Amino acid sequence: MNLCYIDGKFLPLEEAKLPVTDLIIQRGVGVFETISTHSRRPLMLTPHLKRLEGSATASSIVMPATLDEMARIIREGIKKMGCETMVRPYITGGDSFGKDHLFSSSRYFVIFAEIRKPDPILYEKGVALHPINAERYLPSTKSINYMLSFTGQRDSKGAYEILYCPEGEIVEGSHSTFFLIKNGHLITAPTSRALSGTTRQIVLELARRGNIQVEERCPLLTELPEAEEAFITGTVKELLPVVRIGDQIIGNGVPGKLTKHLHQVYLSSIVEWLE
Amino acid sequence: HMNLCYIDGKFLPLEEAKLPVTDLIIQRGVGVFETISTHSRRPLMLTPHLKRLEGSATASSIVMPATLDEMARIIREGIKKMGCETMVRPYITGGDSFGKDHLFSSSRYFVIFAEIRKPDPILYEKGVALHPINAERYLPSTKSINYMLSFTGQRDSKGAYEILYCPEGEIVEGSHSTFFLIKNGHLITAPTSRALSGTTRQIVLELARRGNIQVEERCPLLTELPEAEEAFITGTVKELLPVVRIGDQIIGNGVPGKLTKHLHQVYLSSIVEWLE
Ligand SMILES: Cc1ncc(COP(=O)(O)O)c(C/N=C(\CCC(=O)O)C(=O)O)c1O
Numbered sequence A: 001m002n003l004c005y006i007d008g009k010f011l012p013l014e015e016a017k018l019p020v021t022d023l024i025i026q027r028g029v030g031v032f033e034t035i036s037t038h039s040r041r042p043l044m045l046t047p048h049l050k051r052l053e054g055s056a057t058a059s060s061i062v063m064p065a066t067l068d069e070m071a072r073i074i075r076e077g078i079k080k081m082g083c084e085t086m087v088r089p090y091i092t093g094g095d096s097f098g099k100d101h102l103f104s105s106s107r108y109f110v111i112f113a114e115i116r117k118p119d120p121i122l123y124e125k126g127v128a129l130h131p132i133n134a135e136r137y138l139p140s141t142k143s144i145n146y147m148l149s150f151t152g153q154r155d156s157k158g159a160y161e162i163l164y165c166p167e168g169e170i171v172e173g174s175h176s177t178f179f180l181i182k183n184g185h186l187i188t189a190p191t192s193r194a195l196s197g198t199t200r201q202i203v204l205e206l207a208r209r210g211n212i213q214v215e216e217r218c219p220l221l222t223e224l225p226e227a228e229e230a231f232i233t234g235t236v237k238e239l240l241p242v243v244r245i246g247d248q249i250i251g252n253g254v255p256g257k258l259t260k261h262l263h264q265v266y267l268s269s270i271v272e273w274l275e
Numbered sequence B: 001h002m003n004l005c006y007i008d009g010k011f012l013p014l015e016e017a018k019l020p021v022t023d024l025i026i027q028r029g030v031g032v033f034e035t036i037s038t039h040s041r042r043p044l045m046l047t048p049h050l051k052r053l054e055g056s057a058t059a060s061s062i063v064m065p066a067t068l069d070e071m072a073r074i075i076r077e078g079i080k081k082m083g084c085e086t087m088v089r090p091y092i093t094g095g096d097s098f099g100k101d102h103l104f105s106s107s108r109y110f111v112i113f114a115e116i117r118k119p120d121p122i123l124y125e126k127g128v129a130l131h132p133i134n135a136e137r138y139l140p141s142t143k144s145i146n147y148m149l150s151f152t153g154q155r156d157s158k159g160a161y162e163i164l165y166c167p168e169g170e171i172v173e174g175s176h177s178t179f180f181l182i183k184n185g186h187l188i189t190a191p192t193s194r195a196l197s198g199t200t201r202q203i204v205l206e207l208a209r210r211g212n213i214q215v216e217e218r219c220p221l222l223t224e225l226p227e228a229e230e231a232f233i234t235g236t237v238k239e240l241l242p243v244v245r246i247g248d249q250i251i252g253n254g255v256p257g258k259l260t261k262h263l264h265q266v267y268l269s270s271i272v273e274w275l276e
């Protein structure tokens, strides 16, 4: 069964509740991470917890626990789940923004759920993305505000995921780092504009190992007709091929050879970053 | 009276009200709300606020969890229990799931009742400062719970009262307020194609129509501020709050102006007409 660690206890997820006074509810003041397991070990646990502290600090939220305490809770919850686990620690604003311009009464909780990988057919056929003219503000911060990822899909035509394409510059997915492949090169937005993805970081290391050139610039929507391949990355989805962006088919409209090769190398290599 | 929360069919003490962590308002910021205030313990613009709430929900793919008649019933019953000037905030949550049908079909709702806290009389006397930012509210007709930018954007606000959304130097609105500029004795305010349909905004345009004061529904430009006489922001609690500084730019003579004070007086004299 799914779990939530809150107020010092592991509860059944469905029993865990938060006071309506919390500014995560009232004003969307919250940050979080998604951590996933392979062989019941958390992948890039330390990078994820460093990113969470980064998100909190950048949002003027005082950490309500040490990273060592959060790692302790995360390991104990994975052990209790006894399966491959998706873990989501949340840090809330809590009830007040002080005279000192900090959230000093932050609450936190940690969700544990059995991992749900995208369906194997989505790796075989790839997915469609819906481009929007919008950006994530303070893009290095992973806040809980994913409203546009849902609302901005009243007319997404069954797309898997939103693509933030401010003024036609591709930055990233609502849940994913975006990679374009052009002439055998990787193109991905720089971390000035895109979240510093853990999967992103591993793919750049794999590209270095493979002597695959990476350009850290925003691919343009206007470059898509000349791309060979595209994929999106995240700890759960791994490398997921993108065969359509809006009305634009990417290359031949099926997952490409460099995407499949990089996904195979990822799966073979991720032991190195298991904690 | 103590603060209340209506949730799961009961009025609780606010401090006892809790929401499941499974709710996507918590996990993903899927939430919309309104702020309703009282004059003489009667709700101001209750129907326009509830229609705006349904607008917000519908535009966010959230299936309303109660009828507007039921929400109105709850709001009136809570005001009666408070027996004082009340700020009322109904919230509509995403609930636990986004369906294969691209809707939030298990929305929750709750309603907070709190004693009204007006800005300090000194802020009406001296006016306030706004901090301009190069950003916009996406889905601007929708009032969502996402106010993170209003808080984080105060590392460098220089003590501003409120952030002002000034995408590409075009003034749209505050994080919590409608923005009005005064030039040559008339009103400039962003159109509702770009700004929230403020209930205070709507009343101010009707008062302008009655007073034969010209309203231009265009985004005032940061570059026009040196030529403005006055500015103010509006919201159901703050009423008309003078703005004497935007960024490093002083507005007019740097004190509240005569058309702002006149419109605030007519507002307060006339307010009964929009009570329900
Ligand atoms: C805005 C955004 N960009 C990029 C990423 C990719 O980051 P990483 O490679 O560190 O996972 C995420 C992860 N979004 C997730 C997890 C999705 C996944 O694991 O595939 C989320 O919680 O939505 C994200 O939310």
Ligand SMILES: Cc1ncc(COP(=O)(O)O)c(CN)c1O
Binding pocket: B035, B143, B173, B174, B175, B176, B177, B178, B196, B197, B198, B199, B200, B201, B234, B235, B236, B237
């Ligand atoms: C973005 C925004 N703009 C304007 C307003 C003012 O609307 P009203 O006059 O209905 O309070 C609010 C309400 N706090 C708001 O959140």
